[PDB]
Amino acid sequence: GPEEITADIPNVGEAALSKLDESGIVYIGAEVTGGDILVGKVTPKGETQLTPEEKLLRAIFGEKASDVKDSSLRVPNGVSGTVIDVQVFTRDGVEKDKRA
Amino acid sequence: SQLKLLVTRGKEQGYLTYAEVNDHLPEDIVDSDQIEDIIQMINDMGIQVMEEAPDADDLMLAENTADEDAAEAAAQVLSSVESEIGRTTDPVRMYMREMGTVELLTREGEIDIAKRIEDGINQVQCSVAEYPEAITYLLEQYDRVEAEEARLSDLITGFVDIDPELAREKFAELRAQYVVTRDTIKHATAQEEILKLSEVFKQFRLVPKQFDYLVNSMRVMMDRVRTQERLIMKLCVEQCKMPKKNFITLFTGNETSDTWFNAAIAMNKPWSEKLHDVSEEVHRALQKLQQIEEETGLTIEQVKDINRRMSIGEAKARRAKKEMVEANLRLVISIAKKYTNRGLQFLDLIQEGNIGLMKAVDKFEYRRGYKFSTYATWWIRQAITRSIADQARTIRIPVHMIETINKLNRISRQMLQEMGREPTPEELAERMLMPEDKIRKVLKIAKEPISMETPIGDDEDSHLGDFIEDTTLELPLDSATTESLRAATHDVLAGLTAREAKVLRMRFGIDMNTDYTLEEVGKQFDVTRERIRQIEAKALRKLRHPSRSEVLRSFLDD
Amino acid sequence: EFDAIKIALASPDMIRSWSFGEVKKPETINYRTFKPERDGLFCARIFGPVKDYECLCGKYKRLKHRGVICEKCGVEVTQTKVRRERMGHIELASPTAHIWFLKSLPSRIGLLLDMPLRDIERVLYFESYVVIEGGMTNLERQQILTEEQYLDALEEFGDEFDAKMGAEAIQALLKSMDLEQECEQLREELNETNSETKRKKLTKRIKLLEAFVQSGNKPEWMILTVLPVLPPDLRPLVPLDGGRFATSDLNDLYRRVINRNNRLKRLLDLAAPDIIVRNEKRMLQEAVDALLDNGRRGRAITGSNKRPLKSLADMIKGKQGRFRQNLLGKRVDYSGRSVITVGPYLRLHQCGLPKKMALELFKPFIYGKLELRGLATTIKAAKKMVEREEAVVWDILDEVIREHPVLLNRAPTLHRLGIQAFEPVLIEGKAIQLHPLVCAAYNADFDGDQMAVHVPLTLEAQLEARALMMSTNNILSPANGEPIIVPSQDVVLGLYYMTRDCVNAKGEGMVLTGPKEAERLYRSGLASLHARVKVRITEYEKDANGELVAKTSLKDTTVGRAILWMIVPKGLPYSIVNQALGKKAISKMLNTCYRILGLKPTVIFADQIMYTGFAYAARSGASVGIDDMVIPEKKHEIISEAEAEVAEIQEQFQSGLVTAGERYNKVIDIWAAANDRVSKAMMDNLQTETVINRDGQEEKQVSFNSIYMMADSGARGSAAQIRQLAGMRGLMAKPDGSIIETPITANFREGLNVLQYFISTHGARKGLADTALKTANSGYLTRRLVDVAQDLVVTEDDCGTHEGIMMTPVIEGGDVKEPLRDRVLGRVTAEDVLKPGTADILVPRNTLLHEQWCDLLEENSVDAVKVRSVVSCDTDFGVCAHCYGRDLARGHIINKGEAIGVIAAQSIGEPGTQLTMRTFHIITGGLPRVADLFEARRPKEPAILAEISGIVSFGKETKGKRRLVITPVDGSDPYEEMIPKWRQLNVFEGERVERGDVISDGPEAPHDILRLRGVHAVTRYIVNEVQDVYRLQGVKINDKHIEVIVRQMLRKATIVNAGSSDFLEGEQVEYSRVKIANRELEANGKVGATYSRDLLGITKASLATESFISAASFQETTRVLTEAAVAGKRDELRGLKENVIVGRLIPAGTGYAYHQDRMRRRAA
Ligand SMILES: [Mg+2]
Ligand SMILES: [Zn+2]
Ligand SMILES: [Zn+2]
DSSP states (O other): OOOBOOSOOSSOOSSTTSSOOTTSBOOTTOBOOTTOEEEOOBEEOOOOOOOTTHHHHHHHHOOOOOOEEOOOEEOOTTOOOBOOOOOOOOOSSSOOOSOO | OHHHHHHHHHHHHTOEEHHHHHHHSOSSOOSSHHHHHHHHHHHHTTOOEESSOOOHHHHHHSOOOOOSHHHHHHHHHHHHHTTOOSOOOOHHHHHHHHHHTSOOOOHHHHHHHHHHHHHHHHHHHHHHHTOHHHHHHHHHHHHHIIIIISOTTTSOOOOOOOOHHHHHHHHHHHHHHHHHHHTOOOOOSHHHHHHHHHHHHHTOOOOHHHHHHHHHHHHHHHHHHHHHHHHHHHHHHTSSOOOHHHIIIIIHHHOSSTTTTTTOSOSSSHHHHHTTTTHHHHHHHHHHHHHHHHTTSSOHHHHHHHHHHHHHHHHHHHHHHHHHHHHHHHHHHHHHGGGTTSSSOHHHHHHHHHHHHHHHHHHOOTTSOOOHHHHHHHHHHHHHHHHHHHHSSSSOOOHHHHHHHHHHHHHHHHHHHHHSSOOOHHHHHHHSSSOSSHHHHHHHSOOSOOBTTOOOOSSSOOOGGGGOOOTTOOOHHHHHHHHHHHHHHHHHHTTSOHHHHHHHHHHTTTTSSOOOOHHHHHHHHTOOSHHHHHHHHHHHHHHTSTTTSHHHHHHSOO | OOSOEEOOOOOHHHHHHHOSSBOOOOOOBOSSSOOBBSSSSSBSTTTOOSBTTBOSSSSOOOGGGTTOBOSSSOOBOOOTTGGGTOOEEEEEEEEEEOTHHHHSSSTHHHHHHTOOHHHHHHHHTTSOEEESOOTTSSOOTTOEEOHHHHHHHHTTOOSOOOEEOSHHHHHHHHHHOOHHHHHHHHHHHHHSOOSHHHHHHHHHHHHHHHHHHHTOOOGGGGEEEEEEEOOGGGSOEEEOSSSOEEEOHHHHHHHHHHHHHHHHHHHHHHTOOHHHHHHHHHHHHHHHHHHHSTTSSSOOOBOSSSSBOOOHHHHHSSTTSHHHHTTTSOOOSSEEEEEEEOOTTSOTTEEEEEHHHHHHHTHHHHHHHHHHSSSSSSHHHHHHHHHHTOSHHHHHHHHHHTTOOEEEEOSOOOSGGGEEEEEEEEESSSEEEOOGGGHHHHTOOTTTOEEEEEOOOSHHHHHHIIIIIBTTTOOBOSSSOSBSOOOOSHHHHHHHHHSOOBSSOSSTTOEESSHHHHHHHHHTTSSOSSBOEEEEEEEEEOOSSSOOEEEEEEEEEOHHHHHHHTTSOTTSOSTTTSSOOOHHHHHHHHHHHHHHHOSHHHHHHHHHHHHHHHHHHHHHTOOOOSTTSOOOTTHHHHHHHHHHHHHHHHHHHHTTSSOHHHHHHHHHHHHHHHHHHHHHHHHHHHSOEEEOOSSSOOEEEOOOOHHHHHHHSSSSOOHHHHHHHTSOOEEEEOTTSOEEEEEEOOOSSSOOOHHHHHHHHHHHHHHHHHHHHHTTTTTHHHHHHHHHSSSOOEEESOOOOOOOEEEOOEEOSSSEEEOHHHHHTTOBBSSOEEOTTSSOEEEOSSOBOOHHHHHHHHHHTOOOEEEOOGGGOOOSSSEEHHHHOBOSSSSSBOOTTOOHHHHHHHHHHHHHTTSOSSOOOOOOOSHHHHHHHHTTOOOSSOOOBOOSOBEEEEOSSOBSBEEEEEEOSSSOOOOEEEEOTTSOOSSOTTSOBOSSOBSSOSOOOHHHHHHHSOHHHHHHHHHHHHHHHHHHHTOOOOHHHHHHHHHHHSOEEEEEEOTTSSOOTTOEEEHHHHHHHHHHHHHTTSOOOEEEEOOOOHHHHTTOOSOSTTTTTSSOHHHHHHHHHHHTOEEOOOSHHHHHHHTSOOSSSTHHHHHHHHHHHHHO
């Protein structure tokens, strides 16, 4: 399946998603550091049969599996700048998002 | 002497320019393959044939390897290469040579070859049709067809006539002649009886594969017969030192009765008295002999000559097919020269063409009168095209999809020109009839991927493969976390009662190769899976508590 | 775990023993789903699963289903690293001769069949039938028949006649072959074939036949019938971005084989004619050839490109092969590089590691600490802590790093000092801070170089860095024991400025109470740093059994001399600092401190020297101005005179009094001479200055000019660059070496105009173009030498041999250019050194000649000491510690174990990098002459020697060469020589000459010197020549290293009298083996075999290695592997390079004990 530029990202805990607007892209004006999520992208995947004690862990805490990787774009390490600009390119099939 | 002078002058100079080699290599040589092999051997010598002279330091610094067994071998090749001039290494040159040895065919010659193949197959036809069990099994095939275990057109492709009704009437006529001939060997006219039966059959016609099956049936029949002959004679010729004259005077001529062997122990000879201890196995071999004599419709020798005449026809027609293929190899090369740059080498094109040309030669009929080229060119080009479409890409695209790719390329190459810049995929799907998703996947089909040895390049001379990472590894931090969580799970289950601990270890898959289920768990606890569910739930609730699962909480990642 | 590697020819059955399934279809993946195919090269049944513990389709998706084979796809559920291990095979429809055993030069199939290569290739590519056991019918076994000839010979012969063509023909020739029987017939012919070529090739063939017998190989296994298939993950078809895939070339070649093999099966099933099936077999042959070794046939088949495909032989050989840069040169974890800076406050044992690099490299250690101290609950919590870089990760960094060396390495590791263990000192920023006194070892300046830091991970590697490679252990050059911690440019200029008096400074002729008072006086500014005072100095002299007696006196020194005396340790005299202390004065100061006091006081002294040099150089205020280039006033006078001389010579030339080239020489000489006068005038103007004074009169003292002070302190610069700065520039070369005769009469304090600045560009660009290309092949001599001297190791404590070369001074015509004490220091004496009284044993024997014994030796004037040489060591497979000497990298004697061969290679290669890169003739020089020396090449004009001893006599007149015979005083004279009359003789026919003496004149070929005179003769020759070069340029490198390289050179023996032993006569054998062989055979009731010692150039000697895993590294992998396969060789590892490749400890360093214990087990 396709991958989304969504902001409803896996485990990352609502602080890294603070910069991201609704469509999932950083604001033009934000000062990121190394590690911050510029563009949150979630990718499809399979189940992959989490081993026991991971089964047992998620059964004790009920935190069921995602099924979707967090293959998003975070800033490289050591850089700390301002995000001066953001260009978007949607193919003619894909409709568009709010940021676009 | 000449090339010897060159070698010695090099070995004293330590190098050789291309110019000096050209001056010294012989003048008979015309091709560049012998010249490049000479250069390779002479470099192995080794003297390092160059284009320009080496610097004074490049002689001292250049390592010298490697004498001297290869020195002797190289010199003994180079001393001999100068004599034989026609020497060549390409398989293509050898093929063109040995194909030019044949002489081309003419139109009437193709008619002769086609008629000779027809004569050979017709002789095979007659030899097989003089086998009665052949027509018996054919009637059985048509009967089991008539029971609708096959099709009235599947078993055979009709007869030499254009409706299956006249065909079934031919079947009934064949059955009538068969009954009037088979139970009427009372020999004076039963000869001509089975003659007439085979003749009335010869107007018929079967599917090729069933006829091949009949061929193999007669083959196995004659083979078991002659192998009875083998175990018989070889246990008399070598187990009894049997003179072959006694064989020909007793065995041949009758070949069936027990007079030539079972009446062969009273020949007043020593080997005849030897034949007792070889009378058992040879006696059983005569048993199979007479059994097959019943299983032949006539004696063994007559069926011998029947399958022999079949073999004569088959060999004639096979040599005829061979002569036609030999003639038209040039045609096959002429066709294959058109496809030489679409991914398949030249000899592979020629070989696919040769297979297709054999197939066309098997199908040629000169009753029409067209040129052999005009027909076989079809099968040749189809064979070559399927070959390229099947075994030219590393990732194999089915043939129809490749036709669709060719059509996409054609329509795009036309539309970009006629429409301006380029056809956007919506424009192609509109111009084509496709649904514009099929077109997009056809576009997305990758093409001829790449050599992973491709340069990157010039940074470190590192080919492309150095930067493709392995995404299947559990990185050492991941394995560390895994085993930490394993130990933590153990040290948590320690804080549970024995029942809870066993049910949680077994219900989950800890320290055992399962994954036990509720019925199989409650078997060991004698619960009907409901109390076992409750016990699992209680253990999970207990471990749910904080101050018992803060570490296990930390193992959660979010 | 294995202790040895074995190799052989692979049987068809054994090739199916490896296999997990027969690949049939050519396909790779699905093109839509991308799933592996049912019989393609990427299968799941054959080569295993695609995901871990999960069958192909997906019925079985549990690790509990492990090892079970699925039913719908047959893919057994295992780990998908199994797919990187499993081979498949391809059932060839026709035998196909393995290209290595055919197109290799000796052609094992050809020389084994006793058949010419072209003839086999004719049978193979379907030219001519071959008789394969044609009965008694007058047919000749292995006699080729041609097509027509085979037909007509078959005519009249319906009988078998047994003739075949193609690879099946060679397979039936080999299979029928009886190997021991042919060995028997060849022994019986070698009995009575006593002629050179005949019995020569007889023996040369019986060798391979006996070898094929012993190795277990069958002769017909060289004809492939089954073909193995490399596993999929060794030749992947991975996807790149956007539906893109990247494959190996190996998949292409494999598909080509599979296609043609399937088509051949088809052709045979379809009963095609002879032309078609023959051509299909030829095609399959060429396909399998290209798969194994693409390019030996011609031409290398190209992919979807112009370039050839890469094959198996390519996958191993070549610098892109496995041996070159995946078996030694590997990318390494726990490592990283940055840009080095100075950090002049560090000590010799530490390096400033940035906090960020240190927090990355030491990550697992830090995680372990945080979870040990409870600061992090689990490893995930510690990961998040050190990801945030909290406040306790820094304390944990300080604790973890505390005693944990880091290896610093710079890219051209010419020697082993391009790696040193330092203790990390955490710093801010991102640059590594590297000690100043370490740049000489690293060859590192601080103008943008970078260093790689690696982290030792084990306790054993932590102790190898601390105990062995720590920067305060390595301070002496391993090539020559002089300390490598010489202070470089701000340091020496500091110590020179402070230790350098002037005639009248503040406070002249005060009598200070001592160095403390002189410093207190200077720092309060009452006295100047160079103001000659009487100072009371207490120096401690160990003039005793190490007792350190104190002595106080009243010296005359400057104030800086005494301020600096405060840093010098006890045992050093006071005259060490009482002079100006330029560069060599400081190096000799460190050296005498090391020879008296050892290593700890010398490290402390080096650090104190750097500190005080930098401090008093900053206080020096030593700038550089434009008025500091004092152009002499007599420069234009000298140039007018030289210009007049060239004008006069041009006038004479115009009048036909000289030629053109003659006048060119004259004018070049005139300009060089005037340049010398200007340089001399300017330096005499610059090197002295006037000053006043106690009584008031002017008085000349050495100049305190800054450019001169920098050139004269040795700190940086020299009078030649000074000449270019203020004197005239001179004549300039061209790239050809010619000299442009229009000089540069300008300097750089003046300018050059456009023409002179153009003319200088010629030599400038030539020099830079050379230095840019010398940088490319910077380490080729080192590599060539470590090829041959790699496996040599110090393996024994004393061999006991009494052999030894006689070390004496080198008197280069006039005086000595290298005394005996320098050539002999550190060596173990071989015999008793008798006093000049000729009855007093001066140094008894086995006495490490340290500086005490060396001074005793120079004192008695004993000038020829017999020392033990590495080349005369009676040890087998090694050298002992006594025949070697001392270490020279550590003051002590060599340890049992030390890998001295690699030390010798690097100690000759690294110093060689300071030599000219191109040979120049004056006695030639440069690196290329040294490489040619070690290659032992034959000089074209050999001064001929006297092969036998006896009365000289001549013979026939001018058969090309004038003939001579030497006839012994009582022996036979079977040796005569075709002496060229061009070789103008040296001795008349009436002067009986001793054996081993000159006949003609010219270069002596070392082979003849070795064969005529002792091995000591060849070794002294080689060391004297190569040291001639190294002294030509001024570079110092010991003779031990040349001697060990030579001992690697002459390590082959040629047997003359085979004795009661088991050696063939005209055979060359590893001399270390034949030695033990004759020793053993003489132990029992036999006598040994006598040999003639050989000599091989390093590229030739390194090609003869006992192992083959090693020999496939620096050689042609293909020939070495073919030979090892046909020989059935086994590598019992026992080497450095082999144990590197195979991944265990080397037997050289700390691994020596491991290999000793392992040999204990293997012998028990
Ligand atoms: Mg630099
Ligand atoms: Zn399955
Ligand atoms: Zn020794």
